[PDB]
Swiss-Prot record, chain A:
Cellular localization per UniProt: Cellular thylakoid membrane
Protein name per UniProt: Cytochrome b559 subunit beta
Disulfide bonds: none
Name of the gene encoding the protein in the UniProt record: psbF
Span covered, complete protein: 12 to 45 of 45
Species in which this protein is naturally found: Thermostichus vulcanus (Synechococcus vulcanus)
Assembly information from the UniProt record: Heterodimer of an alpha subunit and a beta subunit. PSII is composed of 1 copy each of membrane proteins PsbA, PsbB, PsbC, PsbD, PsbE, PsbF, PsbH, PsbI, PsbJ, PsbK, PsbL, PsbM, PsbT, PsbX, PsbY, PsbZ, Psb30/Ycf12, peripheral proteins PsbO, CyanoQ (PsbQ), PsbU, PsbV and a large number of cofactors. It forms dimeric complexes.
Swiss-Prot record, chain C:
Protein name (Swiss-Prot/TrEMBL): Cytochrome b559 subunit alpha
Transmembrane segments: 18-32
Name of the encoding gene: psbE
Required cofactor(s): heme b
Subcellular location: Cellular thylakoid membrane
Subunit structure, interactors included: Heterodimer of an alpha subunit and a beta subunit. PSII is composed of 1 copy each of membrane proteins PsbA, PsbB, PsbC, PsbD, PsbE, PsbF, PsbH, PsbI, PsbJ, PsbK, PsbL, PsbM, PsbT, PsbX, PsbY, PsbZ, Psb30/Ycf12, peripheral proteins PsbO, CyanoQ (PsbQ), PsbU, PsbV and a large number of cofactors. It forms dimeric complexes.
UniProtKB/Swiss-Prot annotation, chain D:
Organism: Thermostichus vulcanus (Synechococcus vulcanus)
Residues bearing the modification Blocked amino end (Met): M1
The organism's taxonomic lineage, starting at the top: Bacteria, Bacillati, Cyanobacteriota, Cyanophyceae, Thermostichales
Keywords assigned by UniProt, alphabetized: Membrane, Photosynthesis, Photosystem II, Reaction center, Thylakoid, Transmembrane, Transmembrane helix
Membrane-protein topology: Single-pass membrane protein
Coiled-coil intervals, chain numbering: none
Gene Ontology biological process terms, A to Z: photosynthesis
Topological domain ranges for the Lumenal compartment: 1-7
Subunit details: PSII is composed of 1 copy each of membrane proteins PsbA, PsbB, PsbC, PsbD, PsbE, PsbF, PsbH, PsbI, PsbJ, PsbK, PsbL, PsbM, PsbT, PsbX, PsbY, PsbZ, Psb30/Ycf12, peripheral proteins PsbO, CyanoQ (PsbQ), PsbU, PsbV and a large number of cofactors. It forms dimeric complexes.
Transmembrane segments: 8-24
Entry protein name: Photosystem II reaction center protein I
Family per similarity comment: Belongs to the PsbI family.
Entry's localization field: Cellular thylakoid membrane
UniProtKB/Swiss-Prot annotation, chain G:
Alphabetical list of Gene3D superfamilies matching this protein: photosystem ii from thermosynechococcus elongatus (1.10.10.670)
Topological domains, Cytoplasmic: 1-46, 134-155, 254-268, 450-451
Similarity comment text for this entry: Belongs to the PsbB/PsbC family. PsbC subfamily.
Full protein name: Photosystem II CP43 reaction center protein
Lumenal compartment residues: 72-111, 179-232, 291-424
Location of this chain's protein in the cell: Cellular thylakoid membrane
Gene that produces this protein: psbC
Organism listed in the record: Thermostichus vulcanus (Synechococcus vulcanus)
Gene Ontology molecular functions: chlorophyll binding; electron transporter, transferring electrons within the cyclic electron transport pathway of photosynthesis activity; metal ion binding
Residues the entry annotates as binding chlorophyll a 3: L27
Record: residues binding [CaMn4O5] cluster: E345
Residues involved in chlorophyll a 8 binding: V92
Record keywords: Chlorophyll, Chromophore, Manganese, Membrane, Metal-binding, Photosynthesis, Photosystem II, Thylakoid, Transmembrane, Transmembrane helix
Residues that coordinate or bind chlorophyll a 4: A30
Amino acid sequence: SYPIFTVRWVAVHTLAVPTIFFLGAIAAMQFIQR
Amino acid sequence: AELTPEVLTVPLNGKTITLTEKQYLEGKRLFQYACASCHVGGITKTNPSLDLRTETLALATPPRDNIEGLVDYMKNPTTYDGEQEIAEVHPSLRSADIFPKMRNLTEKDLVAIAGHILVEPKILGDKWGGGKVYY
Amino acid sequence: TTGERPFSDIITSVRYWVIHSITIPALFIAGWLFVSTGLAYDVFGTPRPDSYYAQEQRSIPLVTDRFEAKQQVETFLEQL
Amino acid sequence: METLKITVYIVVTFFVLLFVFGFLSGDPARNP
Amino acid sequence: ANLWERFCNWVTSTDNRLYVGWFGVIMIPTLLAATICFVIAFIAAPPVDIDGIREPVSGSLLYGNNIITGAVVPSSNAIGLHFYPIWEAASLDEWLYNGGPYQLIIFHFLLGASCYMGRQWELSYRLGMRPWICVAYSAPLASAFAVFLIYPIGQGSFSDGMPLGISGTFNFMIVFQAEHNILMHPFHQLGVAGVFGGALFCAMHGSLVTSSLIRETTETESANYGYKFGQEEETYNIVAAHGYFGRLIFQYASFNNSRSLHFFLAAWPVVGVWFAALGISTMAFNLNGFNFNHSVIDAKGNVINTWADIINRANLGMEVMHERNAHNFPLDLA
Amino acid sequence: RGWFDILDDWLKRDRFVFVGWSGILLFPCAYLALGGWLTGTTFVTSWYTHGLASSYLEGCNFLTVAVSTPANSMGHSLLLLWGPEAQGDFTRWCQLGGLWTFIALHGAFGLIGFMLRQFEIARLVGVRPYNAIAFSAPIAVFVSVFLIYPLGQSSWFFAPSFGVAAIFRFLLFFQGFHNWTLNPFHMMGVAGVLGGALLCAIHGATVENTLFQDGEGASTFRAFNPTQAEETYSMVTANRFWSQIFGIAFSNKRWLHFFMLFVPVTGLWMSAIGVVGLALNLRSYDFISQEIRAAEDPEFETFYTKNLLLNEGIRAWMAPQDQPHENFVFPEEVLPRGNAL
Amino acid sequence: ATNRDQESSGFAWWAGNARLINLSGKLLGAHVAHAGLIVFWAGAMTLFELAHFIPEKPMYEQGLILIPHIATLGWGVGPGGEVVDTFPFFVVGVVHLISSAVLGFGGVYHAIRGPETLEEYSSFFGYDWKDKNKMTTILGFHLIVLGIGALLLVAKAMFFGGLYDTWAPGGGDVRVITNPTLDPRVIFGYLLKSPFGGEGWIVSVNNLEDVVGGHIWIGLICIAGGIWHILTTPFGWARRAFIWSGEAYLSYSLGALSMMGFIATCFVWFNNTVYPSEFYGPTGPEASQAQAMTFLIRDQKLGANVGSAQGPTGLGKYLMRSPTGEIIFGGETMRFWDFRGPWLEPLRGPNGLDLNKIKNDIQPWQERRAAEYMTHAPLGSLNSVGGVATEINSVNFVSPRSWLATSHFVLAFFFLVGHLWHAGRARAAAAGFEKGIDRESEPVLSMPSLD
Ligand code: CLA
Ligand code: HEC
Ligand SMILES: CC1=C(/C=C/C(C)=C/C=C/C(C)=C/C=C/C=C(C)/C=C/C=C(C)/C=C/C2=C(C)CCCC2(C)C)C(C)(C)CCC1
Ligand code: OEX
Ligand SMILES: [Fe+2]
């Protein structure tokens, strides 16, 4: 019996949703041909 | 910019031969295999007079700003005026006995080192054969 | 001890991974398609490997202006 | 130089023998 | 009851105002020799030719230095790694010229600061303490090991040691970055993470304990008198500081255990400075920092310079200018 | 109980991460700055401000990425995205160094917001605001270096850039151009930081090696519950240890922990005063008495004049690359070089 | 399930290997599985080094630390450090890696399946840490085995092929060392050598005669010290000089290993006999003397008067004097004048370098070796860019010497810290205050004041 969409959910996701987006983006950079 | 046939055209003998992006990338690696321990960046570490610049190499005797002249250097290395013969101190295909990193260099693989030495000053600029002043 | 669901209880619940086995890979793919489809080179103006220099030119395309500086970058980009 | 060398050498070994013997002279014993 | 068991009753006694210990029978005469020779070399040593090329470097105060520019100049590069005591030299003035005082100081200081470490163990064993204040002193001591002994050994000369001087230190730092790229070495970066964190967690722990002091005094006198020495009550509320710092970041970033807190205060600068001393000790053997010179290149192959290429031009600036006359050859090998 | 009281309730509501009134100013601005660092170090070049590669997209690694400063031509332009230089264009704004001023100003406002948070939480948990007072030393370092130093110089370009190697540029800049090692205000900072790191290591290991035996296990961390009111370590033994090892010891545990607050905070505040001086190029560059001595005596060498020779090396070898706006075209013969290098 | 929480042992999970101090079967499987890890790495790295091996390239140009060790033994190398058969490298990789599964079996067996203590099943194998004559019996068994191991090296050197000699005539060759130095005034005269420059305590061992005979001396005193410690109990002066605890002997070993790692760092950095530069690359000393030689060679070939040629400072640019008087290489390499390699002993006469042996007597193999050793100095980066810190990314070279010295300095310093950790603790444990100070009997409140 707990909430789901707390303040902590926003603290978690506003960091960790662009973190995973950026980690997918930096991992796509490792295959850019020169 | 982009590596392109305008960069990959270099004098063969008064004729120009065109390198490919595979061949220039292969001969950078064969330059770093057997040549760039002394000739890093186009200089000579064991003789900082004789840089690997095109102007220096065009002025060597015989002319070594050609690909036929650089493969003739890698089979018969002379001094800068061509008088004395230095295959006992310089890596060559006459010195597979004493430079073991030269033994697996074929005639389609030396042309890429002759290709890399000529194409690279157009790529870097003054940096090829320029030394730490131009880093 | 403040009220929220414990992190021993969220990421271990399977409903988390019902959500997050299809959102954590989706944003890793979204970020991949930011770079792989080229949108990263267009949102922020970072040049491609064939966009630092013009074909023969080798100068640094450096800003020398302040209020004529957005048009100056575009002059360097129309050069490419 | 001939004299200060053996002067330092005796000084060093006397302090070093004081180091080695005193830790050999029951240093496990000297606990509260 | 001979004068040996009466001698060990003085050496090992905790009743001494300053504890001697058996490590202190080495520590005291070495560090007094390293302190008497230091201040004599800092005021009155004639100029040492450090680089072995007959260009003497004035280090002492009487020769036109102040305390900032004063140093004990490292031993001559002509000596190299050679043992240079006073009896190696023909005169004192020869021993003074070739930087013999530097080898006297650092061999008495390191042997005496190594024996400071075991003396720190030895009082902890006489007092019934847990023993690892010595282990934490191994972090500044390895650092002194590195820049005085290890970096000379790898580079092959006590002229490459850190000069016993304020601006001689800054010479040592500049030349080290020129030759070893110490900023790009991650072990130095863990060391900066050890001293920036060490200064952070000092000011953190210093301010969370000071924030949490129980009212025992009036505002008309100092809050320091709320502590009386030896008291059994804790002078600050550890629950309030954890309640403060836990709400400051989030509750689980916070050491609500005082022992787990002070292990972290112990271990973060110590493992930081351990790695940093391992930076100098590994760049002794020329395992230099990260060399990203001409790493980003474009499609044509033109070098796109980075921030590490701007450091490389600064690194080039110091290295073509350090010891302007010492190099006769194009590569700076050691 | 109106809407200010109700917003006071929800802001000071006891949650996982405490929001508070400062979180209106901390939590966007600290997140835009750190989110803008990661956005700039991943995706934004320095090819028009500096002529550099500084993002992961270009090929840089974590050491070599930075959000680089604006160009010198920008001056101390605030470089708002809507401002006259960017003109709304986000693609142009990242190229003109606009994300540097985005980070240096939101990070400025978040550091106010974190320092206000330290006040606001200490007012609610009932403790003294010494952590805010101790946080004045990272404020004054961030304010002097990232804001006051470029404001004293010609532009934002000479501020440090938000990057690992770019800070390393900035350290080597200040040696060559400012002789910042020789500055006495930086030495008080080195004495304060290394004194802090010493007092972190000493007090950490002193407490951890003077512990009272409160548990029957050989791992001592479970011998502490926090609701206890005993000293967990022997301050009497700790004072007698250091009185005979070092000569002096703390005997006041309140004065010890104030000295731990005092030493890195006074050090970082002294380094601020030097950098504010270096904003105006008020260096302790030279001891005038020694360069008078060394300019008419060519045999008086100290380590001081050796460092000044190194700084001439830095100032002429780094600057045609470090400062591209100046169009320093230094020939291969004006460069100060020792023999053979 | 004894000693597996902190409820039963009083050791946490991060010191959970300390739960095995009094569990002889489990501590045996800890050590045999770890012995299996070292022999795995000996195997798997040798395979990794030989799968990624170019026998054209020299060994130091390939990031190889273990192929140089097999090559120093005299296996698969011929004239001048050149590989003629990579199969003696491959066998050393296979015999180690396959043996790691046997020690991996026996480590896993004694740890997670066998009897937790050996004190019941086998009183010969069951040990108490504070049983002093049993602790020498295992010490005597392990001393004889290291005496067997230091005689196997003598066996390979004298019978089964000989070791690689850097000081073989005409360049380096694998040489059967048939007349080793049995003279103890030479073998133990190395021990009384100064560590400092020109003396180089035991790192200055410069021929394979003293190496083999030193391993006859070490190899037989370790046998005779094994027969000593098997047949005796510790004497009374030693019983009061040591803590007799499990962690105590660990700390004595940790302090011994910190000595050895700091010495092996110095061996791989300074010695080019037992670490030939054919395999490991030029030393720090070797490359700076090679640079001064290359330009001694180059400029005299242009007709420089290299003895009378002056530096900027008044010194000889090519040829100055050491502070003892020997004609040595000019430049900054004057710090490395105590360096002996075999590519410049044909220059060294009795005054140091002979100028008349420089003019008409420098062979082209020496010009080749000096130019090679200059461009393969043990300077390099952590991302393995060769050269100085201001060098560009073209040369993928860090010497094995730099890798081996720095790794065995990182390890040897921490093993000094680990000695200081464990020696302090084991003496605090034998006296009874490692868990803290008793509040009811605190010693300082029973200790008098200072002032
Ligand atoms: C490589 C070094 C190493 C080795 C050899 C060991 C060995 C051991 N540890 Mg230790 N430990 C280590 C590192 C190591 N540890 C590290 C890094 C930590 C911190 C995480 C710990 C923390 C720790 C704690 C807290 C405890 C131990 C315990 C133990 C012992 C028994 C484990 C057991 O019986 O439970 C059963 C173990 C398992 C079921 C895990 C299975 C793992 C298997 C054996 C892996 C190996 C398989 C191998 C590849 C097969 C090869 C053979 C095959 C080819 C035929 C054992 C001797 C325990 C102890 O003290 O015993 C009383 C214990 O409580 N360890
Ligand atoms: C170090 C031992 C070297 C290696 C490996 C290679 N080269 Fe070299 N090179 C070296 C020296 C000392 C000199 C100068 C020789 C002299 O005449 O005194 C050279 C010269 C050249 C030249 C001539 C340059 C000129 O100015 O005319 C060329 C073209 C050349 N080297 C090419 C070259 C190549 C292609 C290599 C790799 C296969 C190579 N060199 C290796 C020293 C060394
Ligand atoms: C092989 C070889 C060789 C040989 C060698 C040898 C012979 C060696 C030996 C060595 C040795 C033989 C060594 C010894 C050492 C010693 C030591 C290392 C010691 C230590 C000590 C201790 C540890 C002590 C401690 C203490 C004290 C101080 C006091 C108190 C008590 C006690 C006991 C605790 C040679 C070089 C020839 C060559 C090469 C090879
Ligand atoms: O002495 Mn002091 O610093 Ca080591 O590098 Mn080489 O030597 Mn000198 O140059 Mn850079
Ligand atoms: Fe505290």
